């Protein structure tokens, strides 16, 4: 065997009597690349999503303009932002706006699940923020979408004197790779989260992150748009009159609409039909609203 | 950058260069006053020195550096009233462009201006950016001039006065923490003629206040150890009038005036006795001075006082300087009965009660060499009245049985057991003087010599008993019979024992070991300048050495004595009479080096040290010339001990790297005795680096290449925790091997660290660092060591008791007038202060506050408290006295 081919983290065989390196076994997989964060061609909404028009203008003037106008930022001498924080009640344009922005800015969309399945091998997060960013640096001009979980992963360095569970170190690793040297280049990040006041954005404020955009509970127009989006991949009848279903329930979040569609499919299945009728949606609204 | 505008400096001080070319002629008012209106402002702004950057320190400087050449010679009105800035751009606005001493050339012209700035510009000139120019111009200009241009161009006439008034001003201004700048300015100025300006500084300190006089004094002792040879010859004599004429401390000087004993002359070596004689202020303080002339460095004048019962308290001064009974034995007794255990029944060699159960069984060693080593061990630790009557009966039966060498070395046990008890010890030795064995009787004669070592008794019992045996027979008993006179009378100079021991030395007797031991006596009876003994030694050498090409025994003892005649004062004037006549035969390059670079003790002259290795480094000698480099290696043991860890760590850096790992024979056999001669207290550097090349026995050659290194590694006294290394080294060299050539040398080399209970002094640095004999006696103890062939036949007798120069290592007593106190002292580590703010803690080791009058070991500085002034020596080393009345509770 040869010394140079021996790397960190490769399985090797040791002999029985005296521990000498017998043969390098082949590795099985890199765990993060096995579960790799799926790059998609971004299927936008084509920006018809009403009600979030203020959010459309704000996300335009906040994140799109640095990508499209490096000349304006260079002429004005303004440092281009790196990250964008989003917050609000769940379901109110968490992932939809990022997809629409990514497709309209001519960039690919990357979604990072990364909640706890990565951190099972304790320090995989310390490589999760590494290799992901490597692909986001090597693939194309793109954006990175990352959820609340990092704030779930760490708040501050109280675990530095407490243990860090090798997760805050992960945050720390992300910290330097969030700082690095980009100046837009080809990689940008968008933060979507809830309960913003647990993480450590005061140190994250100089240079690393920038202006944050709120989200309200959805209006009737955004409710109908969410219902029309989530009724796409469903074999349904024509003439469903989704506006009637939109006015049928008074007011709710966007998370219950998905349950409305699945249990509407349930009630359609109990009718022993491939149809999804209007009365299925009426009983769907009634049963979901009940809970 | 707002520099400019608001400040005047770019406008009016830069308009000021307009009146030397354009106002010297046609403007008598404009000759000076046009310039003077801003020039007095510049002088006032320059005397006020708070900023690095003044409005005239760097702003007018830009034209100032060429203004000293284009404008100042173009002033053409240089007078007394122009000495406000044109006396001051050198001791005030220094220029920016500095090309080495360019201001050295500028201040040739400015030297006549320098009396213009004499008084108003005296204060802030030995501070800020002016004293660099002042000191460097003084030093370099006097270096260039010297005294060859004495009357020529005032380069010695006014420069001496300027340095004198600057040195006066150094304590006139502040008496700062840079008092030691005052020697420095009198140093580089007047390197060779140093004495005149240094006596000017000494008269300035005669005008100075008498409490600062300590600190410059120890600054002088800081420079009276390693400066330059001709600088010793003036600095050690420039110490002399300062605490004698100005101050009247008159005891802190004589403890530190033995530095000037040997390098200057014997006249100054005895003027300590002279000005101790002519000073007669009461009795006590001078009694403290003669308490170290007792026997603590050299007795010398211990028979020089009595004339016609003229000296006040003569009979007490003589009882002190003689070391005799109540000033020694009583004290040691007063400790050993009252602070220690007086039993010590060889339990140091009986503490191995857990070793014959280790590894099976025992009772395998049957060699007849352990008996002698155990005899020496049990006779070694029973010092100070631990007389083991009816315990040496194994030695008594071994007197008449075997080991004639051991029978001689066992009879010295009672002699080395009553050391300094001259009055009681003779009565215990008497019983052996009538023995039917020549070995026992010779060992009892050697015991009588040992008991008197360092004690001058009015009855001369050593001379009076040993005299009759010096010429007794031609055989071995002829050999040893001188040796008592060689030991008890080695620190003095009397002609009677010299002409006593001379005829064996000058009869051309061909028994070489007799001649060697008589030379080892007679060449160091007086460590002085006895030319007759020198001629006798060299003639007796050229009397049998020439017609042979044989072993080192020829050079073992006789050239050692010829070196010992002037050792410690060998300033390379001994070379021209000793070495230059003895260049006859080439086989003894050992001896030629031994008498050639014999020289003297720890001093400077590092060019001799690099001569000792630069020429004869290794030379790849084929076992024919390496003995020259052997001696030249043991010369490197000296020049390092007395400078007090100056080159000592440099020494162990060199031979702990260069020679121990790269030596072919010398570094592995002979170059390890230096750890015993350089140092003796033991620290985890050297006492652990010595077994690193000793735990390997190196059995390729005969095994005693390592046993001598074991003896030198455990040669350090002052009992310690070294029992683990000692016992492990015993068990790796135990009855598994138990080599007979090292069978006695093993047991000698293991348990002799705790040699005496507390009398462990073999340092040879008394007070602070002065030598005090000893090394002359210590040299045959480890220089005669040449592995085997001397522990059995001839050579052991010289290495028996030649190291007996212990000088009462007890570090606690009172001696309050007639011993009226107990006192509470404070032992603490070496003097960490050299130059800071004037009072300071001397050391940082807390103090470990002990009332009990106990020893301190080697490295300590023991101060007092409880308002008792410690008024007698101000050097904190324990001798005596400790008077009272600080008028304070």
């Amino acid at each position: 065997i040869d010394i140079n081919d021996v790397t960190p983290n490769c399985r090797v065989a040791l002999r029985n009597d005296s521990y000498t390196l017998h043969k390098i076994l082949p590795n099985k997989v890199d765990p993060l690349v096995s579960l790799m964060m799926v790059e998609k061609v971004p299927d936008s909404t084509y920006e018809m999503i009403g009600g979030l028009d203020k959010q459309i203008k704000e996300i335009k003037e906040v994140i799109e303009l640095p990508v499209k106008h490096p000349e304006l930022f260079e002429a004005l001498g303004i440092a281009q932002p790196k990250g964008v924080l989003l917050y609000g009640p769940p379901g109110t344009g968490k992932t939809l706006l990022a997809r629409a922005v990514a497709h309209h800015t001519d960039c690919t969309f990357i979604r990072v699940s990364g909640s706890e399945l990565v951190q099972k091998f304790i320090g995989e997060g310390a490589r999760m923020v590494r290799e992901l960013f490597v692909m986001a640096r090597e693939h194309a001009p793109s954006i990175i979408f990352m959820d609340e979980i990092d704030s779930i992963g760490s708040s501050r360095l109280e675990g530095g004197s407490g243990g860090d569970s090798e997760v805050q170190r992960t945050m720390l690793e992300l910290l330097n790779q969030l700082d690095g040297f980009e100046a837009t280049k080809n990689i940008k990040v968008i933060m979507a989260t809830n309960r913003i006041d647990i993480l450590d954005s005061a140190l994250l404020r100089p240079g690393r992150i920038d202006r944050k955009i709120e989200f309200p509970p959805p209006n009737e127009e955004a409710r109908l748009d969410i219902l029309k989006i989530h009724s796409r991949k469903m074999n349904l009848t024509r003439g469903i009159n989704l506006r009637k279903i939109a006015e049928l329930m008074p007011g709710a979040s966007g998370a219950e609409v998905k349950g409305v569609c699945t249990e509407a499919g349930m009630y359609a299945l109990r009718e022993r039909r491939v149809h999804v009728t209007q009365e299925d949606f009426e009983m769907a609204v009634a049963k979901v609203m009940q809970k | 950058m707002e520099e400019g505008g608001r400040d005047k400096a770019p406008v009016q001080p830069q308009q000021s260069p307009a009146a030397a070319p354009g106002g010297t002629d046609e403007k008598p008012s404009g000759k000076e006053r046009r310039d003077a209106g801003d020039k007095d402002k510049e002088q006032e702004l320059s005397e006020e020195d708070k900023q690095l950057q003044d409005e005239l320190e760097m702003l007018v400087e830009r034209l100032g550096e060429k203004d000293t050449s284009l404008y100042r010679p173009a002033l053409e009105e240089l007078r007394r009233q122009i000495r406000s800035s044109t006396t001051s751009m050198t001791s005030v606005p220094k220029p920016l462009k500095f090309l080495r001493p360019h201001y050295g050339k500028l201040k040739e012209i400015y030297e006549n201006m320098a009396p213009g700035e004499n008084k108003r510009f005296a204060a802030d000139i030995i501070s800020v950016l002016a004293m660099t120019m002042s000191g460097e111009r003084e030093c370099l200009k006097y270096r260039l001039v010297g005294s060859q241009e004495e009357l020529a161009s005032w380069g010695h006439e006014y420069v001496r006065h300027l340095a004198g008034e600057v040195a006066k001003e150094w304590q006139e201004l502040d008496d700062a923490e840079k008092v030691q700048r005052e020697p420095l300015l009198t140093l580089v100025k007047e390197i060779v003629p140093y004495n005149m300006a240094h006596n000017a500084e000494h008269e300035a300190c005669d005008l100075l206040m008498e409490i600062e006089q300590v600190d410059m004094l120890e600054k002088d002792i800081d420079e009276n150890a390693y400066a330059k040879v001709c600088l010793y010859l003036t600095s050690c004599v420039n110490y002399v009038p300062e605490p004698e004429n100005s101050a009247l401390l008159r005891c802190a000087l004589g403890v530190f005036r033995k530095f000037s004993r040997f390098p200057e002359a014997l006249r100054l070596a005895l003027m300590l006795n002279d000005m101790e004689l002519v000073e007669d202020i009461f009795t006590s303080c001078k009694d403290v001075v003669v308490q170290k002339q007792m026997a603590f460095m050299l007795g010398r004048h211990g028979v020089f006082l009595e004339l016609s019962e003229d000296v006040e308290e003569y009979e007490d001064l003589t009882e002190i300087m003689s070391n005799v009974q109540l000033n020694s034995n009583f004290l040691a007794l007063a400790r050993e009965l009252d602070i220690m255990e007086p039993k010590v029944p060889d339990d140091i060699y009986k503490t191995h009660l857990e070793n014959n159960r280790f590894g099976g069984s025992g009772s395998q060693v049957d060699s007849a060499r352990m008996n002698l080593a155990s005899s020496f061990v049990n006779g070694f630790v029973n010092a100070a009245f631990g007389q083991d009557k009816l315990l040496t009966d194994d030695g008594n039966k071994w007197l008449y049985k075997n080991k004639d060498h051991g029978m001689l070395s066992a009879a010295a046990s009672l002699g080395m057991i009553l050391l300094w008890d001259v009055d009681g010890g003779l009565t215990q030795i008497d019983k052996y003087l009538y023995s039917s064995e020549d070995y026992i009787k010779s060992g009892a004669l050697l015991a009588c010599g040992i008991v008197n070592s360092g004690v001058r008794n009015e009855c001369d019992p050593a001379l009076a008993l040993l005299s009759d045996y010096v010429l007794h027979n031609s055989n071995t008993m002829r050999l040893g019979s001188i040796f008592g006179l060689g030991l008890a009378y080695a620190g003095s100079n009397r002609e009677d024992v010299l002409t006593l021991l001379l005829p064996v030395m000058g009869d051309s007797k061909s028994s070489m070991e007799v001649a060697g031991v008589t030379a080892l006596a007679c060449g160091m009876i007086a460590v002085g300048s006895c030319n007759g003994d020198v001629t006798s030694t060299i003639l007796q050498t050229i009397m049998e050495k020439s017609e042979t090409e044989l072993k080192d025994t020829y050079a073992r003892w006789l050239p050692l004595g010829l070196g010992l005649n002037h050792l410690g004062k060998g300033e390379a004037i001994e070379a021209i009479l000793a070495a230059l006549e003895v260049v006859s035969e080439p086989f003894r390059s050992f001896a030629n080096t031994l008498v050639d670079v014999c020289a003297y003790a720890g001093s400077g002259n590092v060019l001799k040290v690099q001569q000792l290795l630069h020429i004869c480094s290794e030379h790849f000698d084929s076992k024919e010339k390496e003995e020259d480099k052997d001696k030249k290696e043991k010369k490197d043991k000296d020049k390092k001990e007395a400078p007090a860890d100056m080159g000592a760590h440099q020494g162990v850096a060199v031979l702990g790297i260069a020679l121990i790992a790269m030596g072919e024979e010398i570094g592995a056999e002979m170059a390890l005795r230096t750890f015993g001669h350089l140092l003796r207290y033991g620290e985890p550097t050297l006492r652990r680096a010595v077994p690193l090349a000793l735990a390997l026995i190196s059995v390729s050659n005969p095994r005693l290449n390592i046993l001598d290194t074991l003896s030198k590694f455990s040669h350090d006294a002052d009992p310690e925790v070294s029992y683990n290394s000692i016992f492990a080294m015993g068990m790796v060299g135990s009855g598994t091997n138990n080599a007979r050539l090292a069978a006695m040398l093993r047991q000698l080399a293991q348990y002799h660290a705790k040699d005496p209970n507390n009398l462990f002094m073999v340092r040879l640095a008394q007070g602070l660092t002065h030598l005090g004999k000893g090394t002359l006696t210590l040299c045959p103890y480890h220089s005669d060591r040449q592995l085997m062939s001397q522990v059995a036949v001839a050579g052991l007798l010289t290495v028996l008791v030649s190291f007996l120069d212990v000088r009462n290592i007890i570090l606690g007593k009172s001696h309050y007038v007639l011993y009226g106190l107990v006192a509470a002292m404070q032992p603490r580590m070496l003097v960490t202060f050299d130059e800071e703010l004037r009072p300071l803690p001397v050391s940082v080791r807390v103090g470990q506050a002990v009332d009990v009058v106990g020893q301190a070991g080697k490295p300590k500085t023991i101060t007092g408290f409880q308002t008792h002034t410690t008024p007698v020596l101000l050097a904190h080393g324990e001798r005596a006295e400790l008077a009272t009345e600080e008028f304070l509770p």
Binding site: - | L52, S127, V128, G847
Partner: protein, 393 residues
């Protein structure tokens, strides 16, 4: 071109700068191994590759350590456990006698025959051995002057029984083994503690007052247990506590859902201090700035017998602190200190030490070797104005 510090202050830089790299040249010319994954210099392990390691390998086996639990009668027959391997019943070897073989200390056991070879010192966790001071700071009693009555009271409590156990035996009294120190901050409690640890002739053990407050339940009682056992092992140690309010003085119950664990630690301390075979010849020093929120069990004598107080000196002790703090200076022998103590009415020793440092600050702000007499007078007047402002805000 440049500027020089003092005389030949530039060629000294070269002559000590060339030799420092020439030492590296010496080292590389010899050839020195660098960072051999944990090893020794070749002139330092020259006996390691020798018969020293062969004597370190053949006779001495592993002698794997064990803990003893119970001893039998007549025949030794010790019950033992290793650490986690198993428990056994064993005998001692012939190399050691059966006297220092009592229950409850670690003993070494041969790995083959399972025989006891050599006892070991007992297991002490490293968090309580680090607080053993192992060195003494040098603070002479002459450096804590101005507090003569308090100093002699602390002296006659602590130093006299540990150095003269003759007076109290013939007079038949007992010394107060517990003394509390209190007063305003920065008055000399720390200096008195260092002065006690100066000449103690004994073992001194310091305690950080908030060290015992720990995350898990009951471990602070274990620290107090191991601390007092280490005190009992040696002879005549001195316990020093600092900032005793952290350990606990209150006994609140007003809806007692707050601190209870630190009350348990205080209670285990309170019990180990006194009662049911007391500690012996140990002494306890305590110090706090608010001795009014303390436990009445602590203030009961038999545990705390003297309440030594401190205060804003006098007029004379300010002069004494001036004479002992500003003596390490380069000032001309003309400064009068009683006027300077008159100008500052109410001050601590720390303020006087701060005056002494600001004197050097004035000496350094201007380019002077020393702080001259008028310079010292201007400096002290400016810092008196500055300290009036500083006490104002």
């Amino acid at each position: 071109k440049t500027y020089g510090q003092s005389t030949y202050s530039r060629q000294i830089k070269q002559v000590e700068d060339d030799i420092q790299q020439l030492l590296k040249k010496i080292n590389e010319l010899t050839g020195i191994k660098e960072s051999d994954t944990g090893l020794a210099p070749p002139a330092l392990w020259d006996l390691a590759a020798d018969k020293q390691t062969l004597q370190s390998e053949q006779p001495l086996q592993v002698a794997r350590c064990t803990k003893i639990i119970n001893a039998d009668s007549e025949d030794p027959k010790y019950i033992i456990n290793v650490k986690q391997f198993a428990k056994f019943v064993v005998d001692l070897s012939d190399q050691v006698a059966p006297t220092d073989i009592e229950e409850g200390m670690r003993v070494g056991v041969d790995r083959n025959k399972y025989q006891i070879h050599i006892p070991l010192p007992p297991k002490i966790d490293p968090t309580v051995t680090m607080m053993q001071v192992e060195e003494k700071p040098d603070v002479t009693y002459s450096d804590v002057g101005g507090c003569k009555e308090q100093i002699e009271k602390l002296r006659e409590v602590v130093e006299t029984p540990l150095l003269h156990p003759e007076r109290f035996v013939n007079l038949g009294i007992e010394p107060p083994k517990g003394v509390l120190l209190f007063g305003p901050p920065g008055t000399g409690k720390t200096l008195c503690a260092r002065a006690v640890a100066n000449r103690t002739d004994a073992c001194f053990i310091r305690v950080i007052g908030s060290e015992l407050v720990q995350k898990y339940v009951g471990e602070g009682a274990r620290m107090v247990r191991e601390l007092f056992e280490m005190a009992r092992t040696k002879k005549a140690c001195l316990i020093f506590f600092d900032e005793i309010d952290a350990i606990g003085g209150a006994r609140f119950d007003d809806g007692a859902g707050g601190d209870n664990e630190v009350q348990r630690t205080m209670l285990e301390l309170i019990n180990q201090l006194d009662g049911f075979d007391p500690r012996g010849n140990i002494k306890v020093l305590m110090a706090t700035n608010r001795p009014d929120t303390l436990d009445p069990a602590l203030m009961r004598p038999g545990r705390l017998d003297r309440k030594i107080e401190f205060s804003l000196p006098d007029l004379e002790g300010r002069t004494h602190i001036f004479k002992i703090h500003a003596r390490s200076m380069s000032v001309e022998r003309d400064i009068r200190f009683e006027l300077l103590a008159r100008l500052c009415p109410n001050s601590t020793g720390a303020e006087i030490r701060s005056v002494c440092t600001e004197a050097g600050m004035f000496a350094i702000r201007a380019r002077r070797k020393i702080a001259t007499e008028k310079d010292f007078l201007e400096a002290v007047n400016k810092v008196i104005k500055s300290y009036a402002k500083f006490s104002a805000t």
